[PDB]
Amino acid sequence: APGSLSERKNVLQLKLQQRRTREELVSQGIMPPLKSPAAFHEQRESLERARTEDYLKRKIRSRPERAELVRMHILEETSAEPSLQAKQLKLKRARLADDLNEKIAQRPERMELVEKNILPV
Amino acid sequence: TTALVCDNGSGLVKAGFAGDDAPRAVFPYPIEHGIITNWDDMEKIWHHTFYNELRVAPEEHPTLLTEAPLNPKANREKMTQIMFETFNVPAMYVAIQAVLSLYASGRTTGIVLDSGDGVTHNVPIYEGYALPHAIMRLDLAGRDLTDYLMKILTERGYSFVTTAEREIVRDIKEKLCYVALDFENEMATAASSSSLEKSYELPDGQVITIGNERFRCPETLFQPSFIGMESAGIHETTYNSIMKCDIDIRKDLYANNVMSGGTTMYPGIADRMQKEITALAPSTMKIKIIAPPERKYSVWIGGSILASLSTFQQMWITKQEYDEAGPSIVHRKCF
Amino acid sequence: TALVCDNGSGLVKAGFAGDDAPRAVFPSVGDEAQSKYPIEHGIITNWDDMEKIWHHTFYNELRVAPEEHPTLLTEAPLNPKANREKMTQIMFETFNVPAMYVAIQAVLSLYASGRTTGIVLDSGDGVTHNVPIYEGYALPHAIMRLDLAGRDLTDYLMKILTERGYSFVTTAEREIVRDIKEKLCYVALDFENEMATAASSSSLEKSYELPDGQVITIGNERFRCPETLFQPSFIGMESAGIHETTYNSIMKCDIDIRKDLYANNVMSGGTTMYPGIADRMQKEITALAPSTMKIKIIAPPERKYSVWIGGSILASLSTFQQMWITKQEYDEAGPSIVHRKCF
Amino acid sequence: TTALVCDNGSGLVKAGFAGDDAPRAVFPSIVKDSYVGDEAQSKRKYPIEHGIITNWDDMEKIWHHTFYNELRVAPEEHPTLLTEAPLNPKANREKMTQIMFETFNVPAMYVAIQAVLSLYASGRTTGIVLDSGDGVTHNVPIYEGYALPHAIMRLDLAGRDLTDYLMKILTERGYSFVTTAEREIVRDIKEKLCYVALDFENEMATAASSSSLEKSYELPDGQVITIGNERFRCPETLFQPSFIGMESAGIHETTYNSIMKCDIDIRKDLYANNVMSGGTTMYPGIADRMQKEITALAPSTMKIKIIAPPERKYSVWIGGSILASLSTFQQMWITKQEYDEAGPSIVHRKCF
Ligand SMILES: Nc1ncnc2c1ncn2[C@@H]1O[C@H](COP(=O)(O)OP(=O)(O)OP(=O)(O)O)[C@@H](O)[C@H]1O
Ligand SMILES: Nc1ncnc2c1ncn2[C@@H]1O[C@H](COP(=O)(O)OP(=O)(O)OP(=O)(O)O)[C@@H](O)[C@H]1O
Ligand SMILES: Nc1ncnc2c1ncn2[C@@H]1O[C@H](COP(=O)(O)OP(=O)(O)OP(=O)(O)O)[C@@H](O)[C@H]1O
Ligand SMILES: C/C1=C/C(=O)O[C@@H]2C[C@@H](CC[C@H](C)/C=C\CC1)O[C@@](O)([C@@H]1CSC(=O)N1)C2
Ligand SMILES: C/C1=C/C(=O)O[C@@H]2C[C@@H](CC[C@H](C)/C=C\CC1)O[C@@](O)([C@@H]1CSC(=O)N1)C2
Ligand SMILES: [Mg+2]
Ligand SMILES: [Mg+2]
Numbered sequence A: 001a002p003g004s005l006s007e008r009k010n011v012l013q014l015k016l017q018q019r020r021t022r023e024e025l026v027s028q029g030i031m032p033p034l035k036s037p038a039a040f041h042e043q044r045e046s047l048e049r050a051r052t053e054d055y056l057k058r059k060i061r062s063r064p065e066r067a068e069l070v071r072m073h074i075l076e077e078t079s080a081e082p083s084l085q086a087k088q089l090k091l092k093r094a095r096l097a098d099d100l101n102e103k104i105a106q107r108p109e110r111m112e113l114v115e116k117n118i119l120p121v
Numbered sequence B: 001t002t003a004l005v006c007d008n009g010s011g012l013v014k015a016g017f018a019g020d021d022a023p024r025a026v027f028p029y030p031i032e033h034g035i036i037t038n039w040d041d042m043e044k045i046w047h048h049t050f051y052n053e054l055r056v057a058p059e060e061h062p063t064l065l066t067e068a069p070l071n072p073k074a075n076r077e078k079m080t081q082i083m084f085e086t087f088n089v090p091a092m093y094v095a096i097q098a099v100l101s102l103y104a105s106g107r108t109t110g111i112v113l114d115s116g117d118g119v120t121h122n123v124p125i126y127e128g129y130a131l132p133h134a135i136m137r138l139d140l141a142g143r144d145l146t147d148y149l150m151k152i153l154t155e156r157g158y159s160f161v162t163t164a165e166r167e168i169v170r171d172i173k174e175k176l177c178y179v180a181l182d183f184e185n186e187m188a189t190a191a192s193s194s195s196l197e198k199s200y201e202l203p204d205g206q207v208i209t210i211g212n213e214r215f216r217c218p219e220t221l222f223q224p225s226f227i228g229m230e231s232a233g234i235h236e237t238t239y240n241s242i243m244k245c246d247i248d249i250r251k252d253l254y255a256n257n258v259m260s261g262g263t264t265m266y267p268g269i270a271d272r273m274q275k276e277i278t279a280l281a282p283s284t285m286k287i288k289i290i291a292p293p294e295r296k297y298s299v300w301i302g303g304s305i306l307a308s309l310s311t312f313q314q315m316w317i318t319k320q321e322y323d324e325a326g327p328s329i330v331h332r333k334c335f
Numbered sequence C: 001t002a003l004v005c006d007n008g009s010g011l012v013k014a015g016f017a018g019d020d021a022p023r024a025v026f027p028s029v030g031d032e033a034q035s036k037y038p039i040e041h042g043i044i045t046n047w048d049d050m051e052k053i054w055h056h057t058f059y060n061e062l063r064v065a066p067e068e069h070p071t072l073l074t075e076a077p078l079n080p081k082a083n084r085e086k087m088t089q090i091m092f093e094t095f096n097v098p099a100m101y102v103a104i105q106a107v108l109s110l111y112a113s114g115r116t117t118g119i120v121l122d123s124g125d126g127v128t129h130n131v132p133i134y135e136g137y138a139l140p141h142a143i144m145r146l147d148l149a150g151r152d153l154t155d156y157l158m159k160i161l162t163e164r165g166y167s168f169v170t171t172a173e174r175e176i177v178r179d180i181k182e183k184l185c186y187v188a189l190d191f192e193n194e195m196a197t198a199a200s201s202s203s204l205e206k207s208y209e210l211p212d213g214q215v216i217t218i219g220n221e222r223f224r225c226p227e228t229l230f231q232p233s234f235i236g237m238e239s240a241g242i243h244e245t246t247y248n249s250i251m252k253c254d255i256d257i258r259k260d261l262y263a264n265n266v267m268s269g270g271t272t273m274y275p276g277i278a279d280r281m282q283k284e285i286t287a288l289a290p291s292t293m294k295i296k297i298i299a300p301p302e303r304k305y306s307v308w309i310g311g312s313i314l315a316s317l318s319t320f321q322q323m324w325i326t327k328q329e330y331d332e333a334g335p336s337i338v339h340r341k342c343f
Numbered sequence D: 001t002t003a004l005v006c007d008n009g010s011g012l013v014k015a016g017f018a019g020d021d022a023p024r025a026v027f028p029s030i031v032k033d034s035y036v037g038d039e040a041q042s043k044r045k046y047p048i049e050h051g052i053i054t055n056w057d058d059m060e061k062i063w064h065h066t067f068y069n070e071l072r073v074a075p076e077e078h079p080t081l082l083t084e085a086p087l088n089p090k091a092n093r094e095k096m097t098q099i100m101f102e103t104f105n106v107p108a109m110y111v112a113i114q115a116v117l118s119l120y121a122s123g124r125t126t127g128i129v130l131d132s133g134d135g136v137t138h139n140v141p142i143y144e145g146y147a148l149p150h151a152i153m154r155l156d157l158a159g160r161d162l163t164d165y166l167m168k169i170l171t172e173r174g175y176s177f178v179t180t181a182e183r184e185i186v187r188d189i190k191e192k193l194c195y196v197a198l199d200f201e202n203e204m205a206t207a208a209s210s211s212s213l214e215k216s217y218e219l220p221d222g223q224v225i226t227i228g229n230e231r232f233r234c235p236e237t238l239f240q241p242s243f244i245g246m247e248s249a250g251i252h253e254t255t256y257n258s259i260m261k262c263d264i265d266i267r268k269d270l271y272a273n274n275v276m277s278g279g280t281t282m283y284p285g286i287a288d289r290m291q292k293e294i295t296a297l298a299p300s301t302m303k304i305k306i307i308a309p310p311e312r313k314y315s316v317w318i319g320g321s322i323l324a325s326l327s328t329f330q331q332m333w334i335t336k337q338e339y340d341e342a343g344p345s346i347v348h349r350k351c352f
């Protein structure tokens, strides 16, 4: 109860094996990274922040227009709404393959063409 | 006179101020699965955030809100409506969580894995643009994991079912669980020796002991079947998501796989995801998995960062703009 | 399932029938080689080399059992009967593919467009064709070839960046210039005028950051390089510009279908990705054609893979799942069978 | 074969043996050629003011005096655990190591972070320590036995300063202490009579209101002086450094900030595990007060617990002892062999 020198020793030995590795703890954002400087985690942070802020503030001005992505086939063209898209596109491909099916199915024989004044004997 | 960042999570609001490198307030369902379903409830949540957590004049600060991938236009418009009419916020803006997470990573192109409390998405994003047709949802999230850990601590004899007991098990999850590199092998080794089991002291002093459960719970993320789902594992879903993107930016994506959200904190989830994604992808593919230590709050941080840019000042939605164009304005301004 | 291999001049696009866009695209082994051309101009010239390419596709890119999947291959307009029969032979005897089939790239491109009649402009890496197709039939007598393609364009861009002082000649440097081409080049609507405006300033000149951080800057070269497609003379050719060749190709066809052809002008192949190439082609084709002619240019945003996609779509259509060439058919009739089955 | 625990304080070395419930020897940390500690005080410079070892020759003499005169032992015969201050420079630790091994041929040795030892003695591995000694005061948040440097707080306002300010305010009472001897007198007065008040303004009001607050103190030369609100004003300095001219924030504020400079996740744990150590935390009431303040700065739904072991005047050292005594711990000393094979650098890998 008092924290007798011997009992004080057992809780410790039992809690010092209950312990994760600090590697694991910066791994979880409790620890700052081993290897950086102990004083100056603050400034270090500030600085990496800046670095990022600069990148964002630039990459932002250059930001393309949706349209330009569509030009490139990044975003599907063009309506309707984000959620429907996924499906809508599957509907598109499906309906097209179908509309192609009969189209090729009912494909004239060569002589149809030849007599139709297209292509030689 | 600065900006507020509010990430409305399935399980946890993260609110704070533009600039700071972490949310000041984080507190605990009208947004299960990531989409705002109950607007009265939600309105009360926002009130509590504005007045009780951040203790601020909602009319005095611009507000950046987060929304889930594939939030319906109607939804965003509603958020906007409420911010402007129920809070007379000077201005405001709505952002896609996954995207914010990516920005905080210091990128504009990559594929995010955002696994929070009630939902998990894969969002491929390009120069800020999330590619909807490739987005993946996966209603298996953190809660579910907590549950399954309860339901498997059962085989050990322990019986947690109280809401309070649930919370206990959650803490156990967070403290001891971990994704294994090779699951079958990790099971083999599980039996082989001890050194794997750990000890956990309940609130009431009683010490329980946990074994392979540690790595089986999170394994659910890779095998949804473990909790009865025909869905594919997060890694598979990632792969599929990538592949649904234009063939040219594929490379950029395999090379820029950023993880966010609480549920991605499990030790080893990175190396594992690497293993799997690597195995599914073309043998000559650069594959990189980014797992920022700060990712339990990726989103919110990104939010902050963004709301802080001098550039970004030009793109807020002013109260005036809203008056002149109504909620619809959102669709033109935030994207 | 079924495979779809587009054995391009300088890229192989191989994927699985069904889904849109291939899985593997690699230089025509391939990249890993790049870390150390048997189909220049579009026709398979070296069969040993080609066989190695197919092996690499089957086993390294797609990682599949060649014996377990039917294979659809692409061939160039006017591929010699002997050639097709060789492809067939190799697929069946060197890969024991369950079945297979050979298709005309341009035609596939057209199908993917959702058509069976129209005139395709397929401009890849080593060759550019005009192929008029009617009810799913390519009209050979009207087909146009044009050995001016994408590589040539890359080269000429190098050769003109020279006037700017820059000196790219390494293979690596070539690749750099290629990327520059893809990222910055663009076909101009009015060339003379675009030159005038070029001198006239504002947003024309772009910057471009080399791998080693150094930023170079590019001007009218941007639109001059691709202009070569319309004036082959720019790189020393007595050939007519792609638009002229298109016109001639149409004209070399029966006059009834000509209306159809001018209203269904579909573009495919990488080299057709240059911004504005459509509007320009419209302008020119319009100016060469009869004043009362409906003229439409179709430029699907994903034409960089038109062909291959078509390949997919086609091999999905229930109908076509009857034309395949079964190993049995091949055994009973030899390579010749191809000419009866694929057309 | 029994280990030695040595806590090198700004003002007071605490040395002794592993196992022992409190340090055998405790002597002033100052320095016929050289007189150390108490003998030095007798006739007629502090090499560790502020907590960091600045003079190595002096320090070496201090260690010699500890090894040979206080503990009377064979330095070559006992492993030695030393304490170091939060944020001791890698070079410093390496120097300590060097001197222990080459100047004392100690069989083995190890260096530990005071605040952390204090925490261990509390029976914890996670919490935020307030260690307020003689020459320096720190806030050290520690998690699973690891001190979080980026959140550590230093505060050069410590015990000495308090003694001084008590002198400088006994002046308003007419008394004039300035002799080094007189200083010591005032120190004793501080330790015996001073105390942190719960509400300072109010405690002043009550100070005037009635007597019952003043106490009587007999100087060495029989003469009895009497002390009033000085009692609670001196230690109040810890909460208002301004009292002695400092733009620094009060220990409570600094504690708060230190917590805040930490992972939001672990904060709850920090708030409910606030352990105090070091002499200057012995003032009666400092606990309840710290509770008040920390409570007022923190989120209204926060479990806040202040731990003040009545023995904290030696928290550190005890912890040290405890630790040096664990069977487990025997595997992570630094052997003379290890040192020979890897040089002082070794310390950074072994102690942390
Ligand atoms: N260290 C951890 N390891 C594993 N899971 C954790 C850890 N810490 C928190 N979690 C889990 O993460 C989940 C919450 O993370 P998060 O804050 O991203 O959810 P949310 O924000 O409310 O939902 P969303 O991310 O979709 O907006 C919780 O269920 C929590 O149990
Ligand atoms: N955005 C672009 N703009 C202009 N040219 C491009 C662009 N992208 C790719 N190219 C060029 O397209 C060419 C390749 O396209 P393609 O894949 O059609 O060639 P190929 O398939 O190997 O030959 P073929 O089409 O005849 O089978 C390359 O030379 C490439 O440089
Ligand atoms: N009962 C007391 N009340 C208030 N202060 C006290 C009391 N007893 C001792 N002190 C003061 O505590 C100070 C010393 O405590 P401590 O031993 O922790 O200092 P130190 O160990 O030399 O420095 P450090 O703790 O930084 O290592 C002395 O200034 C002393 O006057
Ligand atoms: C990115 C890419 C584009 C491409 O189409 O490249 C293909 C394949 C390539 C083969 C060598 C190259 C070093 C390897 C890979 C480049 C592949 O040759 C090309 O680049 C040639 C060379 S210049 C040109 O425009 N085409 C075409
Ligand atoms: C009993 C005791 C207490 C102490 O903590 O004292 C230590 C050590 C001391 C050294 C000089 C002194 C004459 C020698 C021994 C005093 C030791 O200085 C201190 O008293 C300083 C001076 S004022 C003060 O409070 N700290 C700290
Ligand atoms: Mg989130
Ligand atoms: Mg082609």
Ligand SMILES: [Mg+2]
Pocket (backbone or CB within 6 Å): D007, D009, D114, D131, D133, D278, D316
């Ligand atoms: Mg101390």
